[PDB]
């Protein structure tokens, strides 16, 4: 919440109070309620437009430190999934000079929730014991359409593990988010097309067109008509079978059974089949491309423009080749000829509408020639091309059918929400901030700095180093669980069940999937996630250089344990052990929002535990920094991506050091903290250097002792923001000598990204769009960092900490915050009669919110 | 501790009191025990802030026997790991004339903790037995993506030895010791560069540069950019694999699976692969080189001076060729084509940022082409060059992170601390002492005597006799345990466990790893080791020549047993046994320092015995002696290497014979022991020779009887020191005849090394910096040794033994303090509970999974036929499990 | 540790032990009188290692002049600079080691002294005529 008065910031909660464990169960924080914070907003100059195309932005009145009012000023929504591949320069589209962003992932295995045998399997193994399965005929089959000898031989496997469904559903949701862009232009907000390329204006007239392997530069086409996997190159393989007898040896151990339930999932069984195949093979198989018409800022130069979705570049799985066992619609013995095998199947597999080339070309609608026990030759198709054919026909409504069918077969609720959380955490992305004295700034067009971007986690994303197909040394980001084929087959055929395998109604499928607003909701869910990480990296003053080197090159023990404990570690079996300090970040999320992140089961030796996306990042990354104008790297600050107003206006609660400044010219305007609470000033007047009231030193006044770092103290961080928000702060050390870290040109602070204005809107003024909360305290060398002013510049702010003066800072006039007159002729305290008439009806709302 | 009055020396503990074995548990000697005394630092502090560059001396006021007081007197720290490779002569840097020091190790399998199969392997065997009812080839689950047939072969025929992990951890700690040097000069002592070359002065302004294969002299660049082994002179081979089936049949029995618990980082994973490859091949793979800017004593001349670290010279024989099996990215059929193999790697191996020449040249960053089924040509690389390319990139903080990931699979705390103890025992080294009257001496620059050196055990280090690579091999100096690849494979995957292999709740390593302060501490841990070994040798009177020939001597029989039980050459029931008398030195260390040395276990029939580094030396080396001012050897003394102020100022308890001479205090100064202690003066036929009060048996032996030697007496040793400490002694026979052993020029005693002074310092005076406790008693040919004075020179010392008179001696002006053996972050307080339960669960994590036998049973055709039902797992008996018992 | 300038309304406290160590530092022949940061203070300082000493007078036969620091003020340990800075006494690290261990009572410092003992006296006449007249004096004095 933003503060109307300084009493509101004195009464704010401590960081430690919010990092404390909360025991109660909480609701998920959907974008369907995050949506309403952007709409339904104070301000009279606002033309409250209905279309979601225009609800893309944070609008509001503002108030200057000089006492002036500014109407309908603007702040952009920081995240996006699109990556530009054509860039406007000189009012025209021009081919991009920068390489594509890439993401990578490691598999894990799932011993949690071990399976339980059904009565069916137990009676079958019983029959194996009393007989030798000798009772059965050559042609006996179940109603499902598989013969008994196969079910019997599958039954004989014994499995330690549970079943997961995670990687599966994740691939389905990534594809969902890519297909969700195909709706009409009114249904997607235009700010998403200009977070990176800020010289470009999308047209509302036509929908974006989703294609594949159409990219202009850097080998992005992936060989075009002959499709090769973007990572590593090469084609896969896919084959179809009526029995597992026909699958070749050394592949018999890896075969998947396709239940008839997958085949009756949708109106076209081939589409459901290809969807299952894509769901259980390696991702990506190809690079999808979003094309959208755009025009010049003057409107002069319209044309089509290409974008590459962030979901398209994440790397998951490794199963290049696969075999699928298909139901037989008739009760028959295993086929000996080709025509018998063709007639035998429940529905014969077919190529999709879009034809492809290659050594094994596929004509559109081409029918597969089924395998049989006679083997003049084994028969097979290239897999990337088989998926290139069906790539255009996948659609969010059909995916909604498919999810309903899966929900009926096994519960998909919890698992899909968790997979959706991972989709948000991996695909949503924001550009690195540039520094300024004023309200708005951005990096040069088609510059390398324009395209640097980061996660909600504030880890910078990896960039490709060479033309596709890639032959890179991998640099993975996070671990994910994998879906096991044998454990799959035991469940697909009624041979086993688990505690998390309970069947559900189709009605219970989460509402995001198949909805056309989903893209928008995606962006929204990125905002709270950052806030939590932002509060973790700011409570301690560690600089970005110190975060870049703690894991790889620094002799201080405390940074080493610090970077080490923020991330997860492996168990002897190879299972995840969750990140130790990650549990803190989760707590923050639940105290600032009163909503919960998705939980996932995990085990250590046969002991239950949970895991969230907060606890599953890998150590060894590089961190967010900011750029000076002209693009020089600066890294004195603790890492930052998004402006304070975002952190301040969405939280139900924030820690004291992060509160908003009250408006200028009132009684109880911005102030500071002094000795009485417990602080002490450092002075250096021999060199014109004065620093705020700070924490009492503990033998760590100039160098921190090895094995210790700066303490959490909200009030000193606050005073440091006060010294910073004054015009010319200077970042030096205890003696007043220069620190090793690169520093901003004097007076500059990092600020939010510029976007083109709508008519009637204004650029934000002053530090209204600045990030202020990231005050440095700990350098890579281990020395303390000090914010200094000169002895003259420092005289009023000292009196304000001392509470014998007020300070003046800019604000947003939102949510009960009003402007302050220059006089301040106070009267007797007086409740207004309208506030007494409406007091109860007002409290009822708060109580109703407290219930929720 | 330093005596203040004669009452304190007279009441000091007897030697037999301190060599008794003790029962209490004790904390490790971390080396901060000395740091509190010889330095400013009181609490944890930045090494750069502290300038420990200047914290490298014993300092203090000294009192002279003539009654003057010298202020700011100094004594150097004896040990170092750096061997100068260019030397200053005539104020000008010049090349070394002396060949390099070398060490050799013995490496063998021995019994450790008993081992047992985990629950998970019982699961795998149940899977095979349940499969046997079918026609289907999929026998068991394929763990962590490795081929299921490979899990089937790894999960078979376990060895009863247990597993050690010692050689691995040694190689890692040697490398950590070498890269530790690379930090800035403000955190390394000046003295470390001038223990041997006392004429050079290192500059504080630049960090030392560590490199590989650079040395100017004697062929010590082992191939240079075309590397070869320093000892073998060959080159290795290294090959990477996805499955065991592609490994050539000649060496499938030697292969090592690489666990994926390491390689989990976003970065530095290929480097982790190179490092893991280094920890299981032969050492050294190259000669490392430390290069430091230095200047002349006046600070005029300046240059880059070359040094060889000792850690890079000590040989640990291992495999030369090797085959590693990389984790698969997803369960899948084995690759039949190259692209399928390259796409499938979890971490794809590559060369480090440093090009090499020769056959199979390696470009920086070069990627490896994976081996696969049906491949036209097998691929591999030379290993010495692969380890060469990464060699310049390794550093301390990465080794710490690696070792921390390694910590979560297996116990590595105690094992690492023991291997670190062995590091310090083989690496810290001191130059031999010079005899003199005064407080300081040194041998001529660039001479054989300048560079002759010794272990903390008082044994000289052998030199090379020819240019590198060495055509031949030295006798082994010490024996270490080896690490078997088979049982490593079983344990890395979770198939087996033992009490020493259990992961520890700290989930963390010893404090020494990852610190820039490590070199200083390692330098300080060698001191206690020498204090205990010198007490061992000086309790008895044997001379260096007599030790030097003791093993084979047939003049006397006791001398042979004495030499023979100080080394490790006994075994029983298939396993190594500790030296019988090394336990005495171990006992002495505990009673004197109130700390416990690190130890490994050995199982003897299942009983556990501890073994410290004291008990594992091997016979064959030469004992330390001292040189004359001219460089002639002196044999007459007991072995010695350090001045006795180091011994007597850093102990909690000290044997009586070794204490300091007490300070003058009015009338009373120094005092002796007489016939009222049970002693007797010795006289011979010659009337102008007198020897002190000595044990009564001394009157009835001139040759010791065969099967007997000189006894422990502390008081007689005391009077022996009082006689020697006069400036005019004779080292002679019962009859006054000359002994066979070489004796020093008259009145001289060995003294500690000279180093250049800082402004305000003074050199040590008189006998304030000398060994004194080395009193000879056993001649090489079996004669007793006596110390004689003339009659007139005899009168005051005898009355002083009678306590009628007083002797005048120098002392340090120092007090006694011996410290007690002794951080939560706010985040740690936030998370302490969850850490406390999860750490408890990891201790039992083993090969455990939540699925029980009771669940898996329901999935079986026949429970009674399950091998888990008919063979529940047991810990293996030792040396062997029972086979074919008589029904 | 938490002041380089004293806070307004506050100055250095009585501590006798800290003043003692201040004297032990000064009494070495090579001290630096400096700032928290090691910078020079505004006040004039003596040529290095010197301390104020008592006045010279001519000797009588058999007398000797006082030696070393046996005739000097030592107790004058500066702490409050004119411009509000604290004053510190600094040694170099190598010069620092023996004095620090002496504060720890592991080592010993060498100083001159007088060879003198302690005696402090208690705070302390009738004539025959006075005894003759004592009574009359006692009453008349009262009157």
mmCIF file of N, CA, C and O in Angstrom, chain B residues 31-64:
data_model
loop_
_atom_site.group_PDB
_atom_site.id
_atom_site.type_symbol
_atom_site.label_atom_id
_atom_site.label_comp_id
_atom_site.label_asym_id
_atom_site.label_seq_id
_atom_site.Cartn_x
_atom_site.Cartn_y
_atom_site.Cartn_z
ATOM 1 N N UNK B 31 45.446 -24.885 14.516
ATOM 2 C CA UNK B 31 46.522 -23.943 14.266
ATOM 3 C C UNK B 31 46.262 -22.518 14.715
ATOM 4 O O UNK B 31 47.138 -21.674 14.624
ATOM 5 N N UNK B 32 45.057 -22.247 15.203
ATOM 6 C CA UNK B 32 44.742 -20.936 15.767
ATOM 7 C C UNK B 32 45.357 -20.785 17.143
ATOM 8 O O UNK B 32 45.477 -19.674 17.680
ATOM 9 N N UNK B 33 45.774 -21.921 17.687
ATOM 10 C CA UNK B 33 46.434 -21.988 18.978
ATOM 11 C C UNK B 33 47.731 -21.188 18.972
ATOM 12 O O UNK B 33 48.088 -20.579 19.972
ATOM 13 N N UNK B 34 48.431 -21.182 17.842
ATOM 14 C CA UNK B 34 49.653 -20.399 17.710
ATOM 15 C C UNK B 34 49.340 -18.982 17.257
ATOM 16 O O UNK B 34 49.978 -18.022 17.697
ATOM 17 N N UNK B 35 48.329 -18.857 16.407
ATOM 18 C CA UNK B 35 47.933 -17.571 15.861
ATOM 19 C C UNK B 35 47.533 -16.574 16.932
ATOM 20 O O UNK B 35 47.804 -15.384 16.794
ATOM 21 N N UNK B 36 46.913 -17.041 18.009
ATOM 22 C CA UNK B 36 46.566 -16.116 19.084
ATOM 23 C C UNK B 36 47.800 -15.520 19.758
ATOM 24 O O UNK B 36 47.760 -14.395 20.238
ATOM 25 N N UNK B 37 48.890 -16.276 19.799
ATOM 26 C CA UNK B 37 50.122 -15.805 20.424
ATOM 27 C C UNK B 37 51.064 -15.003 19.532
ATOM 28 O O UNK B 37 51.567 -13.973 19.952
ATOM 29 N N UNK B 38 51.315 -15.444 18.307
ATOM 30 C CA UNK B 38 52.354 -14.770 17.530
ATOM 31 C C UNK B 38 51.828 -13.670 16.609
ATOM 32 O O UNK B 38 52.542 -13.197 15.731
ATOM 33 N N UNK B 39 50.587 -13.241 16.817
ATOM 34 C CA UNK B 39 49.972 -12.295 15.888
ATOM 35 C C UNK B 39 49.035 -11.328 16.625
ATOM 36 O O UNK B 39 48.694 -11.563 17.779
ATOM 37 N N UNK B 40 48.661 -10.226 15.966
ATOM 38 C CA UNK B 40 47.603 -9.318 16.435
ATOM 39 C C UNK B 40 46.190 -9.860 16.501
ATOM 40 O O UNK B 40 45.414 -9.428 17.342
ATOM 41 N N UNK B 41 45.846 -10.767 15.594
ATOM 42 C CA UNK B 41 44.454 -11.166 15.416
ATOM 43 C C UNK B 41 43.874 -11.820 16.663
ATOM 44 O O UNK B 41 44.490 -12.701 17.256
ATOM 45 N N UNK B 42 42.675 -11.388 17.046
ATOM 46 C CA UNK B 42 41.999 -11.927 18.219
ATOM 47 C C UNK B 42 40.724 -12.669 17.833
ATOM 48 O O UNK B 42 40.343 -13.645 18.473
ATOM 49 N N UNK B 43 40.075 -12.205 16.772
ATOM 50 C CA UNK B 43 38.846 -12.807 16.300
ATOM 51 C C UNK B 43 38.885 -12.889 14.797
ATOM 52 O O UNK B 43 39.868 -12.500 14.188
ATOM 53 N N UNK B 44 37.819 -13.391 14.188
ATOM 54 C CA UNK B 44 37.797 -13.562 12.742
ATOM 55 C C UNK B 44 37.912 -12.199 12.076
ATOM 56 O O UNK B 44 37.251 -11.248 12.477
ATOM 57 N N UNK B 45 38.757 -12.107 11.059
ATOM 58 C CA UNK B 45 39.052 -10.823 10.443
ATOM 59 C C UNK B 45 39.551 -11.012 9.030
ATOM 60 O O UNK B 45 40.090 -12.060 8.692
ATOM 61 N N UNK B 46 39.384 -9.987 8.210
ATOM 62 C CA UNK B 46 39.832 -10.057 6.837
ATOM 63 C C UNK B 46 41.343 -10.173 6.792
ATOM 64 O O UNK B 46 42.039 -9.346 7.366
ATOM 65 N N UNK B 47 41.861 -11.205 6.116
ATOM 66 C CA UNK B 47 43.311 -11.381 6.014
ATOM 67 C C UNK B 47 44.022 -10.199 5.371
ATOM 68 O O UNK B 47 45.158 -9.922 5.721
ATOM 69 N N UNK B 48 43.373 -9.530 4.433
ATOM 70 C CA UNK B 48 43.948 -8.348 3.811
ATOM 71 C C UNK B 48 44.034 -7.132 4.727
ATOM 72 O O UNK B 48 44.963 -6.345 4.627
ATOM 73 N N UNK B 49 43.059 -6.979 5.614
ATOM 74 C CA UNK B 49 43.060 -5.899 6.591
ATOM 75 C C UNK B 49 44.175 -6.078 7.621
ATOM 76 O O UNK B 49 44.737 -5.113 8.127
ATOM 77 N N UNK B 50 44.482 -7.333 7.928
ATOM 78 C CA UNK B 50 45.422 -7.675 8.982
ATOM 79 C C UNK B 50 46.890 -7.626 8.584
ATOM 80 O O UNK B 50 47.756 -7.622 9.456
ATOM 81 N N UNK B 51 47.160 -7.582 7.284
ATOM 82 C CA UNK B 51 48.523 -7.573 6.763
ATOM 83 C C UNK B 51 49.329 -8.714 7.376
ATOM 84 O O UNK B 51 50.296 -8.474 8.088
ATOM 85 N N UNK B 52 48.938 -9.957 7.113
ATOM 86 C CA UNK B 52 49.591 -11.089 7.760
ATOM 87 C C UNK B 52 50.872 -11.401 6.992
ATOM 88 O O UNK B 52 51.549 -12.390 7.245
ATOM 89 N N UNK B 53 51.168 -10.529 6.037
ATOM 90 C CA UNK B 53 52.442 -10.455 5.348
ATOM 91 C C UNK B 53 53.588 -10.158 6.325
ATOM 92 O O UNK B 53 54.718 -10.581 6.115
ATOM 93 N N UNK B 54 53.275 -9.429 7.395
ATOM 94 C CA UNK B 54 54.252 -9.003 8.400
ATOM 95 C C UNK B 54 54.094 -9.695 9.748
ATOM 96 O O UNK B 54 54.623 -9.230 10.747
ATOM 97 N N UNK B 55 53.347 -10.793 9.779
ATOM 98 C CA UNK B 55 53.007 -11.464 11.026
ATOM 99 C C UNK B 55 53.696 -12.821 11.132
ATOM 100 O O UNK B 55 53.085 -13.798 11.544
ATOM 101 N N UNK B 56 54.966 -12.888 10.754
ATOM 102 C CA UNK B 56 55.610 -14.166 10.477
ATOM 103 C C UNK B 56 56.842 -14.495 11.311
ATOM 104 O O UNK B 56 57.779 -15.110 10.814
ATOM 105 N N UNK B 57 56.843 -14.099 12.575
ATOM 106 C CA UNK B 57 58.015 -14.237 13.423
ATOM 107 C C UNK B 57 57.583 -14.400 14.860
ATOM 108 O O UNK B 57 56.523 -13.918 15.238
ATOM 109 N N UNK B 58 58.392 -15.083 15.656
ATOM 110 C CA UNK B 58 58.305 -14.942 17.095
ATOM 111 C C UNK B 58 59.066 -13.678 17.471
ATOM 112 O O UNK B 58 60.145 -13.427 16.950
ATOM 113 N N UNK B 59 58.486 -12.893 18.371
ATOM 114 C CA UNK B 59 59.003 -11.589 18.751
ATOM 115 C C UNK B 59 58.995 -11.467 20.264
ATOM 116 O O UNK B 59 58.167 -12.080 20.926
ATOM 117 N N UNK B 60 59.916 -10.690 20.825
ATOM 118 C CA UNK B 60 59.896 -10.458 22.261
ATOM 119 C C UNK B 60 61.200 -9.954 22.819
ATOM 120 O O UNK B 60 62.215 -9.974 22.137
ATOM 121 N N UNK B 61 61.164 -9.462 24.049
ATOM 122 C CA UNK B 61 62.377 -9.033 24.723
ATOM 123 C C UNK B 61 63.165 -10.224 25.226
ATOM 124 O O UNK B 61 62.593 -11.221 25.639
ATOM 125 N N UNK B 62 64.484 -10.100 25.216
ATOM 126 C CA UNK B 62 65.347 -11.150 25.728
ATOM 127 C C UNK B 62 66.245 -10.646 26.842
ATOM 128 O O UNK B 62 66.668 -9.493 26.859
ATOM 129 N N UNK B 63 66.528 -11.537 27.780
ATOM 130 C CA UNK B 63 67.445 -11.253 28.864
ATOM 131 C C UNK B 63 68.747 -12.024 28.685
ATOM 132 O O UNK B 63 68.738 -13.219 28.443
ATOM 133 N N UNK B 64 69.871 -11.330 28.820
ATOM 134 C CA UNK B 64 71.189 -11.940 28.675
ATOM 135 C C UNK B 64 71.749 -12.424 30.001
ATOM 136 O O UNK B 64 71.325 -11.985 31.057
#
